Design a protein around this nucleic acid. Structure first.
Ligand code: DTP
Ligand code: CA
Ligand code: CA
Ligand code: CA
Ligand code: CA
Length: 903
DNA sequence: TCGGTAAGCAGTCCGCG
DNA sequence: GCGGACTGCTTAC
């Protein structure tokens, strides 16, 4: 097999590399790497090295990395550019792996772990590590085993051994319901003292040294706790055994309630699953407890136990250990679904970076571009200092707030990367400038053609048409991968709907799910077999289709994110290829494209409808247009349609056969106007929206920019079994909105769009009547808690103190003296509830760590003093008022002359 | 050696016979 | 008690 790296580190003048060799064995080597950098030289000198602008360079081979770094400093002081890769481990990887890396994930040791620490005096701070570690579960991907280290004797209680037999039993039978599929993979190791537990764990760690280290919150809790606990008991040198190179870095944040620290373990790639989830999931959650996320992702119930966690080991050691095990497994279950570790590996090896650098689009792109240029013997420019400067972005149309009955939307494929490719935007493809006209003049095609030689953007930039740019070249490769995966995702989505349709008429038979690849549209023969399947097999197929869809979603959305990241990186001052000429060349072109095609679509639809000057495009954001299809439906006459699906089919055909060709013609003209390298403005139909035929539903509404709701029957070629609400920006979509309020608002919207005003009024009346009976957590608002200390004046709110922070300060005063009360953590999220006047908390609101029940000593007071009236008005009534006023509907029947009668 | 902009709404402070 | 200038938070691209 071909070799591939596992980890790489620079330590002084040494590169330390862990890798897999040709025989598939894990090896480690220390290399006294001799790096090269480059200086511009005169033209009279024969060289094979050229910078990206074709200027000749001389290579400087250094005896060591420090010598190379020192030369950079001298060059800075002289005032001359020091070219080449200054992150020497990237140069090392590029030199050692001068080919496309084919990695074998089965040879990579992925460790998932978590620890337990009983603490009778508050949260066990990792920086202090004053309490015994009393459990570790460490899962090894190579062994496929859960190694459980269980402390039996501790100053906080002596306990009996954990029982695997009781662990496997149902909870309803007194067991812990440790999943059956992992029972046989558990290796249980009890210890009579912590010193032997930890010594054994370190020996274990030496034998099975993680390459990828993950788990939930491991970076901020498990890792620094283990490191500091070992340091306190055995000494710092022993703690450093957690690094295969015996080197660590301790970073102390300290601000300001307690000192926290992050430990860098050289030779390990830590990918805290919490950080992977936040980067790659595209959710915003009200809480990031593992219980919350596991319920969201897997539909598994909370791990239930009696009493506080500080007393769980002593009261129920059996459950304590089982829950430690299940917690580790839950992260594995989330990854089996989401496939973020797979993504990280794919991306890391593609770029040739440390795997943990996937968190940085700048590092990733620097490495991709460096490797690309190096293959051509080109020399990368030195990074330079730039002041931060605001610059213009996308255009968003101001919509007329209203109900909109029939809507069809259209959207440009991968816009910013497509602009890069179309215009040929790269640091080295700049040909010059032209004198700009007002943007409106380009949009309306009245401005002079910028150039008949070069490829242009309406920001004034010109690019070479007849040469390749490294940015377009490399962005295209990732775009093409993205496109492949999005194809698989959409096919799986379409296949899902086929299964949902079949589930309306399931067969009474004993059968099996079909052996199919869900990444491809089902053949006619598969569809025939599906119509004969039982409910049991159909539901299993639907699960597999949806898992396939999620896998494709992960793969495509994050490749989309990486390429959009490159467009944004051009506007980040720390990017090697920072250039506002290129950043604004993209965004300005986008503004033109949207407004150009708005004009073209209005022109076209007026023409085919036999009218002039009507506004068909009601809204657009960045690269999308929303077209009112009322006149199109009315042109043929609504009475001509047999059912909803009939008019949906008609609009689908209209969009594809008439509008898209006109849109294509419009953009081809824009391309020749800007004299661009390649036409890549591909704007396809996205949503077909409207009310069910014959209903009083309003179809859709806009309240303003970035705020709308649509009843969608078809999305990007997926014809839904059941209509789906597309809601953007409204409170239903915000993590700050109470859970039960999100639900009620969405149903209010569903009724508006699908059923009409009377239906809405019926639901509103019920919700208002029952509101006070909802669980307090379901009706609590959520906020991130930033800069708490800033507004903390003797436990009381200082000037301009935000509402949620005031809630936290109220909570802090309420729990003073309480030892078991959970502290609010700076930067994390809190539930917030308003309090009625005269409450014993002494303020208008209270806030507590999100995803948790509020502590028992103040729970009864909060429930007694909760302001339901304020809660309902602020979170439910006020947003609903916004929706209905925009839609010209009432959520409450207004008084009229009819009230004089007895109906 | 760490490494995108546009834009809506809730809330505080302030003016306000 | 509301509107206006400002911070903060959050979402749509
Ligand atoms: N998360 C983001 N980071 C940076 N730029 C973004 C992001 N989301 C959107 N943009 C910018 C760049 C996009 O090309 C442009 C249009 O957004 P959008 O339509 O969501 O995606 P897209 O056009 O890149 O891909 P798609 O093919 O899925 O439509 O807005
Ligand atoms: Ca735990
Ligand atoms: Ca798009
Ligand atoms: Ca059937
Ligand atoms: Ca879009």
């Amino acid at each position: 097999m071909k070799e591939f790296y596992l980890t790489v580190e620079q330590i002084g003048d040494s590169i330390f590399e862990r890798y897999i060799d040709s025989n598939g064995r894990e090896r480690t080597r220390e290399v006294e790497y001799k790096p090269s950098l480059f200086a511009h030289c005169p033209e009279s000198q024969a060289t094979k090295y050229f910078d990206i602008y074709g200027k000749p360079c001389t290579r400087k081979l250094f005896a060591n990395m420090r010598d190379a770094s020192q030369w950079i400093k001298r060059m800075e002081d002289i005032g001359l550019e020091a070219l080449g890769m200054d992150d020497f481990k990237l140069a090392y990887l590029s030199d050692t792996y001068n080919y496309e890396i084919k990695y074998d994930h089965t040879k990579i040791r992925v460790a998932n772990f978590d620890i337990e620490v009983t603490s009778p005096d508050g949260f066990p701070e990792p920086s202090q590590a004053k309490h015994p570690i009393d459990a570790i579960t460490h899962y090894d991907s190579i062994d496929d085993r859960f190694y459980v280290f269980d402390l039996l004797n501790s100053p906080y209680g002596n306990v009996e051994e954990w029982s695997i037999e009781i662990a496997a039993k149902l909870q309803e039978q007194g067991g812990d319901e440790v999943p059956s599929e992992i029972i046989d993979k558990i290796i249980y190791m009890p210890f009579d003292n912590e010193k032997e537990l930890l010594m054994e764990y370190l020996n274990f760690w030496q034998q099975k040294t993680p390459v990828i280290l993950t788990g939930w919150n491991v970076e901020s809790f498990a890792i620094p706790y283990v490191y500091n606990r070992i340091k306190n008991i055995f000494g710092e040198s022993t703690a450093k055994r957690l690094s295969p190179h015996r080197k660590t870095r301790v970073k102390v944040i300290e601000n300001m309630y307690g000192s926290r620290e992050i430990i860098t373990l050289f030779g390990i790639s830590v990918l805290d699953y919490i950080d992977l989830y936040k980067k790659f999931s595209f959710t915003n959650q009200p809480s990031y407890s593992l219980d919350y996320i596991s319920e969201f992702e897997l539909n598994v119930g909370k791990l239930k136990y009696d009493g506080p966690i500080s007393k769980l080991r002593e009261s129920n050691h059996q459950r304590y250990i089982s829950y430690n095990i299940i917690a580790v497994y839950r992260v594995l279950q989330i990854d089996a679904k989401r496939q973020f570790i797979n993504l990280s590996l794919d991306m890391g090896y593609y770029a040739k970076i440390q795997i943990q650098s996937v968190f940085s689009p700048i590092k990733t792109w620097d490495a991709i571009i460096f490797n690309s240029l190096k293959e051509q013997n080109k020399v990368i420019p030195q990074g330079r200092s730039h002041p931060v400067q605001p610059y213009p972005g996308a255009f968003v149309k101001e919509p007329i707030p209203n109900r909109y009955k029939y809507v069809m939307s259209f959207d440009l494929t991968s816009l910013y990367p497509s602009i890069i490719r179309q215009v040929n935007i790269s640091p080295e493809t700049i040909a010059g400038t032209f004198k700009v006209a007002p943007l409106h003049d380009y949009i309306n095609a009245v401005a002079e053609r910028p150039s008949d030689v070069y490829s242009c953007s309406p920001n004034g930039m010109m690019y070479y048409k007849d040469r390749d740019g490294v940015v377009p070249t490399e962005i295209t490769k990732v775009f093409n991968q993205r496109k492949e995966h999005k194809g698989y995702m959409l096919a799986a989505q379409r296949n899902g709907e086929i299964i949902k349709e079949a589930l309306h008429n399931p067969n009474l038979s004993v059968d099996e799910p079909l052996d199919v690849d869900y990444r491809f549209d089902f053949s006619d023969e598969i569809k025939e077999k599906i119509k004969k399947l039982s409910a049991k097999s159909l539901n299993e197929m639907l699960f597999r289709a949806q898992r396939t869809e999620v896998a494709g979603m992960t793969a495509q959305i994050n490749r989309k994110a990486l390429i959009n990241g490159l467009a944004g990186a051009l506007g980040n001052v720390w990017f090697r290829y920072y250039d506002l000429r290129n950043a604004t060349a993209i965004t300005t072109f986008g503004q033109m494209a949207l407004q150009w095609i708005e004009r073209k679509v209005n022109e076209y639809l007026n023409e085919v409808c036999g009218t002039e000057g009507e506004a068909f495009v009601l809204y657009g954001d960045t690269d999308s247009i929303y077209v009112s299809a009322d006149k199109i439906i009315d042109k043929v006459g609504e009475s001509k349609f047999r059912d909803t699906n009939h008019w949906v089919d008609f609009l689908d055909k209209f969009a594809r056969e008439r509008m898209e060709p006109a849109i294509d013609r419009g953009f081809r003209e824009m391309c020749e106007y800007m004299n661009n390298k390649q036409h890549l403005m591909f704007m396809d139909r996205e949503a077909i929206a409207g009310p069910p035929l014959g209903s009083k539903g309003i179809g859709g509404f806009w309240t303003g920019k970035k705020r709308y709701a649509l009843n969608v029957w078809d999305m990007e070629g997926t014809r839904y079994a059941e209509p789906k609400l597309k809601i953007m920006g409204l409170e239903t979509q915000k993590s700050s909105t109470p859970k039960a309020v999100q639900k009620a608002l969405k149903e209010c919207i569903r009724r508006m769009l699908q059923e009409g005003e009377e239906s809405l009024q019926e639901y509103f009346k019920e919700f208002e009547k029952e509101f006070r009976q909802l669980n307090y957590i379901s009706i609590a608002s959520v906020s991130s808690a930033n800069n708490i200390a800033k507004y903390d004046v003797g436990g009381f709110p200082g000037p301009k103190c935000p509402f949620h922070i005031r809630g936290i300060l109220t909570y802090n005063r309420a729990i003073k003296g309480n030892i078991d009360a959970p502290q609010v953590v700076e930067g994390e999220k809190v539930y917030v509830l308003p309090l009625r006047e005269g409450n014993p908390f002494g303020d208008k609101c209270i806030a507590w760590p999100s995803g948790t029940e509020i502590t028992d000593l103040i729970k009864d007071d909060v429930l007694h003093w909760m302001d339901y009236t304020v809660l309902l008005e602020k979170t439910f009534i006020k947003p609903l008022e916004g929706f209905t006023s925009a839609a010209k509907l009432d959520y409450e029947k207004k008084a009229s002359l009819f009230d004089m009668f007895d109906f």
